[PDB]
Design a binder for this molecule. Structure first.
Ligand SMILES: CCCCCCCC/C=C\CCCCCCCC(=O)OC[C@H](O)CO
Ligand SMILES: CCCCCCCC/C=C\CCCCCCCC(=O)OC[C@H](O)CO
Ligand SMILES: *C/C=C(C)/C=C/C=C(C)/C=C/C1=C(C)CCCC1(C)C
Ligand SMILES: CCCCCCCCCCCCCCCCCCCC
Ligand SMILES: CCCCCCCCCCCCCCCCCCCC
Ligand SMILES: CCCCCCCCCCCCCCCCCCCC
Ligand SMILES: CCCCCCCCCCCCCCCCCCCC
Ligand SMILES: CCCCCCCCCCCCCCCCCCCC
Ligand SMILES: CCCCCCCCCCCCCCCCCCCC
Ligand SMILES: CCCCCCCCCCCCCCCCCCCC
Ligand SMILES: CCCCCCCCCCCCCCCCCCCC
Ligand SMILES: CCCCCCCCCCCCCCCCCCCC
Ligand SMILES: CCCCCCCCCCCCCCCCCCCC
Ligand SMILES: CCCCCCCCCCCCCCCCCCCC
Ligand SMILES: CCCCCCCCCCCCCCCCCCCC
Ligand SMILES: CCCCCCCCCCCCCCCCCCCC
Ligand code: NA
Length: 270
């Protein structure tokens, strides 16, 4: 029984270890992750004047999301390099007992913080019609919290109890589904009473939102998407998962933010 090796990254690291490629690739993608958030932070701060007052809370929330994402993704990247160490004899990177072990906590904390802000921020750009701001907000914040919390519980069982992993994941997915349903309503109401240029941007926001948020349960499942014998149940799963999380992060935070900013501009003077 493999004592050292919590989560799938540790498990792989403690058994098969990571190739140079896999270790370096993962380091670099996580580094790109936080680098982009820092760039984003400066972007959202510096452009805030370019939208009308009434929209500025959206740019503000983007900036705050960028701060949290930069800090926690920076910590996650450091946690990656600290957790695995090169063995010359075998020529691979293994879980380092004198390190702290890989910890998904950083990313899940980032999600808990950012999910409510990302869902919230669209409400400061669009106008609802027949829905109440407070109802939509409360729905977003509750479902968002529950989605991440149940996900985080699931994640614990990733190695040790796949049944629990998947059941908690399914419960989490239910909250996710509900978020998608609410957000679709928000975008539809948001499209009413605005210019076609604005409607087009909102169509794109919907598509970006749907794809980028769905990447997360994708990445959660990733090591198992070819069965317990398959090619992804390996350092290849770890690489894929971290790549997909990073793409999702950039898309759901930065690209999302840029589209909302462009929507606010389109509404702002035009
Ligand atoms: C992203 C979340 C989407 C996930 C949605 C999936 C559907 C979940 C519902 C029922 C799962 C049924 C349980 C099947 C698990 C079988 C466990 C197994 O075969 O492996 C032995 C394990 O190690 C010892 O529990
Ligand atoms: C490869 C290294 C990783 C870097 C990854 C890039 C980070 C995101 C940056 C830009 C997103 C592009 C979004 C561009 C959207 C344009 C806005 C728009 O919709 O058009 C304006 C509107 O029509 C009238 O205001
Ligand atoms: C900036 C970070 C964001 C937008 C994170 C979003 C995270 C999710 C949408 C996570 C969803 C999950 C499921 C739907 C099932 C498996 C567990 C999660 C938490 C990964
Ligand atoms: C106006 C558009 C500004 C583009 C900003 C490009 C980011 C550069 C990254 C920093 C290196
Ligand atoms: C009109 C909209 C212009 C889009 C500019 C988007 C700028 C976003 C800056 C963050 C991404 C920069 C990546 C640099 C990391 C190295
Ligand atoms: C556009 C008005 C902004 C008011 C701030 C509301 C957000 C505070 C969250 C509690
Ligand atoms: C609301 C934004 C404040 C940032 C929250 C993230 C806390 C920093 C922890 C980094 C790990 C050390
Ligand atoms: C880009 C280079 C980053 C330089 C250092 C970043 C500092 C992040 C600190 C993470 C923990 C914050 C403690 C509150
Ligand atoms: C529901 C999400 C809760 C995530 C909490 C994890 C916080 C741990 C921060 C990093 C762990 C340090 C080692
Ligand atoms: C402003 C929207 C509320 C998000 C704040 C962060 C959520 C608490 C997580 C700790
Ligand atoms: C969508 C409804 C799903 C009901 C399951 C609720 C599970 C509660 C999670 C406990 C959190 C501690
Ligand atoms: C999982 C990714 C594909 C799902 C596409 C869902 C598109 C949203 C359309 C609304 C229908 C789903 C509503 C879910 C139930 C809402 C709870 C009330
Ligand atoms: C057909 C118009 C497509 C533009 C919407 C944004 C594309 C989705 C980006 C995927 C995120 C990763
Ligand atoms: C028409 C404007 C398209 C905006 C979507 C941007 C998605 C970028 C994916 C790479
Ligand atoms: C219905 C939304 C389409 C997005 C598919 C992306 C999810 C794939 C999971 C990553 C592997
Ligand atoms: C909510 C489920 C999202 C997972 C999509 C990825 C699985 C598709 C690959 C086969
Ligand atoms: Na290392």
């Amino acid at each position: 029984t493999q004592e050292l090796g919590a989560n799938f990254e540790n498990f792989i690291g403690a058994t098969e270890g990571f190739s140079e490629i896999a270790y370096q690739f993962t380091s670099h993608i996580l580094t790109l992750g936080y680098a982009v958030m820092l760039a984003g932070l400066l972007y959202f701060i510096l452009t805030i004047k370019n939208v009308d007052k009434k929209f500025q809370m959206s740019n503000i929330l983007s900036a705050v999301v960028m701060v949290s994402a930069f800090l926690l993704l920076y910590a996650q990247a450091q946690n990656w390099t600290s957790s695995f160490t090169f063995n010359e004899e075998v020529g691979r990177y293994f879980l380092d007992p004198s390190g702290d072990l890989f910890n998904n906590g950083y990313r899940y904390l980032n999600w808990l913080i950012d999910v409510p802000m990302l869902l919230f921020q669209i409400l400061f750009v669009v106008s609802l019609t027949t829905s109440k701001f407070s109802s939509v907000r409360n729905q977003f914040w509750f479902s968002g919290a529950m989605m991440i919390i149940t996900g985080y519980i699931g994640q614990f069982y990733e190695v040790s109890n796949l049944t629990a992993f998947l059941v908690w994941g399914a419960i989490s997915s239910a909250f996710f589904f509900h978020i998608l349903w609410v957000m679709k309503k928000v975008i539809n109401e948001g499209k009413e009473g605005i210019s076609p240029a604005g409607q087009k941007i909102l169509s794109n926001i919907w598509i970006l939102f749907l794809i980028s948020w769905t990447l997360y349960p994708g990445a959660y499942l990733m090591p198992y998407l070819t069965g317990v014998d398959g090619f992804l149940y390996s350092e290849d799963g770890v690489m894929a998962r971290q790549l997909v999380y990073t793409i999702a992060d950039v898309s759901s935070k930065v690209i999302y933010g840029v589209l909302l900013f462009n929507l606010a501009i389109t509404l702002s003077k035009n």
